[PDB]
């Protein structure tokens, strides 16, 4: 076949990643660490030509968001965006797909060719659940964490409920110092994914029910592995700034705008 014309706007995933949703599924996203069933075609955006089509092998795939192969970083990206019976349209830069040298047999790709992929979910398997610590490995405690990032990303959204801060709280909980510190690569990047969120989460979630200082913190946990975040360096202005402090309050105002 080839690429669906769709005029659905087009989401932004990722710097080199976006979706045109052209069907709607019903559900919710998947969370980090789900194992994804799923039909795809797969498109180069320029010479749109065909390469990979799981609906002619009528054989579809399993992903594993995190776990995912080199090459499908880009779709694992769009993935994690859409539900099951979502069907879309994913545009993924050569960087996070077949995209160095191209690859030459079994999927010929181009050298640095722009993947268009036409995705259809089937549904998503979650990682599974026991005791805090108990017999959880990694990939366990991330998704849980990123479930429960979820969980309290609904009771938090124009108002501030604390049980959403009590749901971010327990992301964090999960996955602390101890285990964070015995953690490596895309094991370390996905929890991070979910752990340095989940505070600028617990932060406004402080900003607006009358604690400021314990929302500046927050954003310090956070602005020491990544000073450069924005998202943070503004949130932190803003309790300083209900704290009278505009001679640092404006500080992260400021290079907050970089």
């Given at each position: 076949n080839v690429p669906p014309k769709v005029?659905?706007?087009?989401?932004?995933?990722?710097?080199?990643?976006?979706?045109?949703?052209?069907?709607?599924?019903?559900?919710?996203?998947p969370s980090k660490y789900s194992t994804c069933f799923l039909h795809y075609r797969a498109?180069?955006?320029?010479?749109?030509?065909?390469?990979?089509?799981?609906?002619?092998?009528?054989?579809?795939?399993?992903?594993?968001?995190?776990?995912?192969?080199?090459?499908?970083?880009?779709?694992?990206?769009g993935v994690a965006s859409m539900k099951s019976g979502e069907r879309a349209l994913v545009h993924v830069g050569w960087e996070?797909?077949?995209?160095?040298?191209?690859?030459?047999?079994?999927?010929?790709?181009?050298?640095?060719?722009?993947?268009?992929?036409?995705?259809?979910?089937?549904?998503?398997?979650?990682?599974?659940?026991?005791?805090?610590?108990?017999?959880?490995?990694?990939?366990?405690?991330?998704?849980?964490?990123?479930?429960?990032?979820?969980?309290?990303?609904?009771?938090?959204?124009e108002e501030k409920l604390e049980e959403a801060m009590q749901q971010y709280e327990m992301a964090i909980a999960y996955m602390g110092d101890d285990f964070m510190f015995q953690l490596y690569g895309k094991y370390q990047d996905m929890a991070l994914a979910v752990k340095n969120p989940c505070h600028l989460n617990i932060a406004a979630c402080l900003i607006k029910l009358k604690r400021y200082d314990e929302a500046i913190g927050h954003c310090n946990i956070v602005l020491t592995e990544e000073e450069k975040n924005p998202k943070a360096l503004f949130r932190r202005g803003k309790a300083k700034a209900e704290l009278g402090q505009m001679d640092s309050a404006r500080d992260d105002f400021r290079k907050a705008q970089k």
């Open positions: 005029d659905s706007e087009a989401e932004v995933l990722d710097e080199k990643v976006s979706k045109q949703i052209i069907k709607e599924g019903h559900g919710s996203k498109w180069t955006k320029n010479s749109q030509h065909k390469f990979e089509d799981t609906w002619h092998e009528q054989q579809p795939i399993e992903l594993v968001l995190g776990k995912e192969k080199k090459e499908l970083a880009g779709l694992a990206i996070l797909a077949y995209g160095k040298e191209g690859n030459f047999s079994f999927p010929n790709v181009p050298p640095m060719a722009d993947l268009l992929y036409e995705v259809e979910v089937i549904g998503f398997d979650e990682t599974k659940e026991g005791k805090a610590r108990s017999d959880m490995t990694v990939e366990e405690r991330i998704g849980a964490a990123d479930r429960r990032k979820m969980d309290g990303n609904s009771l938090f959204k």
